[PDB]
Amino acid sequence: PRGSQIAKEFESFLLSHLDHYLIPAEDVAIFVDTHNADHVMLLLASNGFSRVPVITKEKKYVGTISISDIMAYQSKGQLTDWEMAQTDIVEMVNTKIEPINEAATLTAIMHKIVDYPFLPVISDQNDFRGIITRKSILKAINSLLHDFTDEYTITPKNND
Amino acid sequence: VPRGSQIAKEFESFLLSHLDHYLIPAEDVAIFVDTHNADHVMLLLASNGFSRVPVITKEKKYVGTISISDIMAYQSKGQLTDWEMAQTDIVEMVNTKIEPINEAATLTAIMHKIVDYPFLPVISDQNDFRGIITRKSILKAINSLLHDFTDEYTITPK
Ligand SMILES: [Pt+2]
Ligand SMILES: [Pt+2]
């Protein structure tokens, strides 16, 4: 059979704080597929971002990029610094984090946010809608842990 | 004890009794020593997939954290040459912004602090490094809470 779902009461409460875990595309730092390998490497080391979403000039999701992705590509094809200043990031884009849909179940988001630091949210047409981070989920989880008892009563159950 | 807004005692009880393994021990956490040369640390951080790593002393005592952005910022601050950077240990570029939590910290405080930082170094009263609590390990426990809380508890509308 299929696995367990999160309690309907928890899913109901968290869906009243949707604004918290979904971070819109306009508030998320991104790189374009046509951007320079060396330039985004210098930028990733200055900003100190583990990995950043890569999108196209028409705002469509491509993958993610990190310093370790660029550095692995440099070793793989023995590319010099001058050659890296002429290479776009399309060729070294990480596609391991499978993007979730806008209509994803909160039970799936909770399972996937454990595995990845962030989940890119896309439309059925692959338009980058934004990201869901471990931090934004924990903000909503924190409100749940403090305010769940405002609309709900929890009583212990004895199974013995 | 005049405590403020606390997490529900039922949630705190469940998280403490079933999945208290969110306190990743010091033996399972990758670390750097404060004497490790900056360039080799930078090369290691760029080879492995790590945003920032805890820095402990030779005597397993907490010092701070290190990231590529910490080393690179120190390099431009003093426009240091690559041979000057080779001799340099990471203890001069260490990041002490993440204030370590105590072993005796409340779960309510851990939950407020894990939102702010990707991980919380857990230390003793003598600053002995005990391990870390990550956003990932907290989310594993939170996931078990969201699925199995109703095993020992009944939730009814108020
Ligand atoms: Pt690099
Ligand atoms: Pt560097």
Spell out the alpha helix ranges (H) of B60-134: 68-77, 82-87, 107-116
CA distance A21 to chain B (A): 12
**Which residue in A134, A135, A151 is closest to B158 by CB distance?**
A151
**CA torsion through residues A113, B113, A17, B4, sign:** positive
A133 Cα–ligand 2 center, Å: 26
Upper half-sphere CA count for residue B60 (Cβ side, 13 Å): 12
- Which residues are CB-contacts of A86 (< 8 A; sequence separation ≥ 6)? A36
Q: Which residues of B touch A159 (CB under 8 A)?
A: 151-152
B135 is annotated as contributing to ligand binding: yes
Q: How many other C-beta atoms can be found within 10 angstroms of the C-beta atom of residue A4?
A: 12
Instruction: Return the ∠ at Cα A42 (arms to B114 and B68), rounded to 5°.
Output: 40
- Residue carrying structure tokens 């990190």: A66
Amino acid making up residue A1: P
Q: Give A155's contacts in chain B (Cβ within 8 Å).
A: 153-154, 156
Other CB atoms within 10 Å distance of the CB of residue A49: 15
Residue B136 marked as a ligand binder: yes
Listed in sequence order, the residues at least 6 apart from B120 whose beta carbon sits closer than 8 Å to its beta carbon are B98, B100, B101, B110, B113, B114, B132, B133
- Return the percent helix, strand and coil in chain A, to nearest 5: 45, 25, 30
Q: What is the CA radius of gyration of chain B?
A: 19
Q: What technique determined this structure?
A: X-ray
The rounded distance, in Å, linking the Cα atoms of B112 and A117 is: 18
Q: Which of A94, A134, A147, A155 to mutate to test the interface with B (most CBs of B within 10 A)?
A: A134
Strand order in the sheet with A31-32: A31-32, A52-55, A61-65
Token duo for residue A35:
């951007």
What six digits make up the tokens of B139? 């989310």
Q: Is B125 annotated as a binding residue?
A: no
Place of tokens 């990932």: B136
> Phi and psi of B107, rounded to 5°?
-60, -25
Question: A11 CA to chain B: closest CA distance, Å?
Answer: 9
Residues 6+ apart with CB under 8 A from B125: B102
Please report the number of interchain residue pairs, chain A to chain B, with beta-carbon separation below 8 angstroms.
Answer: 108
Pairing of β B62-66 and β B101-102? unpaired
Among residues B73, B118, B64, B69, the alpha carbon closest in space to that of A67 is found at B69
This structure's resolution (Å) is 2.6
Measured between CA atoms, how close is A124 to chain B, in angstroms? 27
CA dihedral B53, B28, B116, A131 (to 10 degrees): 90
Rounded CA-CA distance A34/A93 in Å is: 11
Helix, strand and coil content of chain B, in percent to the nearest 5, comes to 45, 25, 35
Q: Could you tell me the residue ranges of all domains in chain B?
A: 1-158
How far A10 CA sits from the closest chain B CA (Å)?
A: 7
Q: What is the DSSP letter of B60?
A: S
CA-to-CA separations, B60 to A82, A129, B65, B88, in angstroms, rounded:
42, 44, 14, 21
Closest CA to A144 of B118, B98, B101, B143: B143
Q: Rounded CA gap, A145 and B80, in Å?
A: 48
Residue in A6, A71, A155 nearest the CB of B146: A6
Q: How far apart are CA B107 and CA B120, in angstroms?
A: 12
Alpha-carbon torsion, ordered A68, A70, A75, A79, to 10 deg? -160
- Contact partners, residue A59, CB within 8 Å, separation at least 6: A25, A127, A128
Contacts of B78 (CB under 8 A, 6+ apart): none
CB of A53 within 8 A of CB of A61?
A: yes
Residues of A with CB below 8 A from B46's CB? 67-68, 71
Q: Residue written as tokens 């930082």? A: B117
Q: For residues B80 and B37, give the distance between their C-alpha atoms in angstroms, rounded to a whole number.
A: 14
Q: How far is CA B6 from the centre of its chain?
A: 22
